[PDB]
Write a protein that binds this ligand. Structure first.
Ligand SMILES: Nc1nc2c(ncn2[C@@H]2O[C@H](COP(=O)(O)OP(=O)(O)O)[C@@H](O)[C@H]2O)c(=O)[nH]1
Ligand SMILES: Nc1nc2c(ncn2[C@@H]2O[C@H](COP(=O)(O)OP(=O)(O)O)[C@@H](O)[C@H]2O)c(=O)[nH]1
Ligand SMILES: [Mg+2]
Ligand SMILES: [Mg+2]
Lengths: 186, 191
């Protein structure tokens, strides 16, 4: 059993990301996610090796807003227990959504050098960043990932090549999930 | 307060009242604007095991509303099946005005318990829309659901999910619900 929280502002592409991570295909008709949605990634630990083993990784998309009232956040807090990894999702076209990752992470880790829970920062809508602005956008997200002591992936969740097997993105994703499993069990 | 995870599946046909039931069980209020549930929805019931005794211990019980249809294609049920692992209890939900939804509970249970005397996972059968049953016919409906619940070796609760008093503390419903969750916890942790 493995529980990975998927955190981020509404509209950044969480449901699309989760769908790609669990089904290797693009989420075609994303609807507004009500409540906590859970999808399972059938994950090959140490993929491609003779010690390959299957784990069911639960991706918990709990939802909500960092601008919610205190009482709303307290009810959300019961979902943040027994967490084995966290994916922090931001929309690369919306600087507000990456800033809000600091609020999201504090909600969990207080209700970063000392944090032992593996973290992964994912920027979505990379396709929407003009080549003109890519250097500036990505320099900032590097600072973001370092603050969390986290690896970073930037991708287009609506392009199935984003996580194609053997791609650089797919390799980093497998490394993160293997680290989640290792810190939980080994 | 306990970091120990407890997983209870909530199974039943679309439209029987799963989301309304779960909302009442987790939020102590009626679900006012039920929408069509997409994919797997999870909510948490904070449960005091052996409440009121010196062994009282709080557990977070996850209610997993996985969804789908017993008529889905083989490939759909195969992907759904990965949601049925590490299960500590099952709530089987049927709509008391819809006899087909009760019959389909046999299919739902087979989907899980293949991926009833020998089953070790605690089961609870919950019939909804009791308010929609004519008072004349309530006795007849409840005789039938009693036999249904016996087939599953399960306790049964019948209620109106839109009446918040259905889960009133100390009521017959609340006692049976606590007994079920205590057995779920006991079979996982104190067995
Ligand atoms: N162009 C583009 N659109 C995206 C990307 N990721 C998500 N979307 C779109 O952004 C909208 C919000 O995505 P959704 O997954 O529902 O976001 P959520 O509210 O965080 O779960 C949807 O219309 C998606 O199709 C991406 O990488 N590129
Ligand atoms: N009168 C009555 N209506 C109910 C009851 N349970 C559910 N409903 C209604 O039945 C419809 C379907 O309920 P819902 O919770 O969405 O079912 P689901 O598809 O199983 O999640 C909704 O309009 C509910 O308001 C009940 O016990 N009594
Ligand atoms: Mg969503
Ligand atoms: Mg529903």
């Amino acid at each position: 059993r493995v529980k990975v929280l998927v955190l981020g502002d509404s509209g950044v592409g969480k449901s699309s990301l989760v769908h790609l991570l669990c089904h290797n295909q693009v989420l075609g008709n994303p609807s507004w996610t009500v409540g906590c949605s859970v999808d399972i990634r059938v994950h090959d630990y140490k993929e491609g090796t003779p010690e390959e083993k299957t784990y069911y990784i639960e991706l918990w998309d709990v939802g909500g807003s960092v601008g919610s009232a205190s009482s709303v956040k307290s009810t959300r807090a019961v979902f943040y227990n027994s967490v084995n990894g966290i994916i922090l999702v931001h929309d690369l076209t919306n600087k507000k959504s990456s800033q809000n990752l600091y609020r999201w992470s504090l909600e969990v880790l207080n209700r970063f050098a000392d944090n032992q829970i593996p973290l992964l920062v994912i920027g979505t809508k990379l396709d929407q960043i003009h080549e003109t602005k890519r250097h500036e956008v990505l320099i900032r997200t590097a600072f973001l990932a370092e603050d969390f002591n986290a690896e970073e992936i930037n991708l287009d969740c609506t392009n199935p090549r984003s996580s194609a097997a053997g791609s650089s993105n797919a390799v980093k994703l497998s490394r993160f999930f293997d680290k989640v499993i290792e810190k939980r069990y080994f």
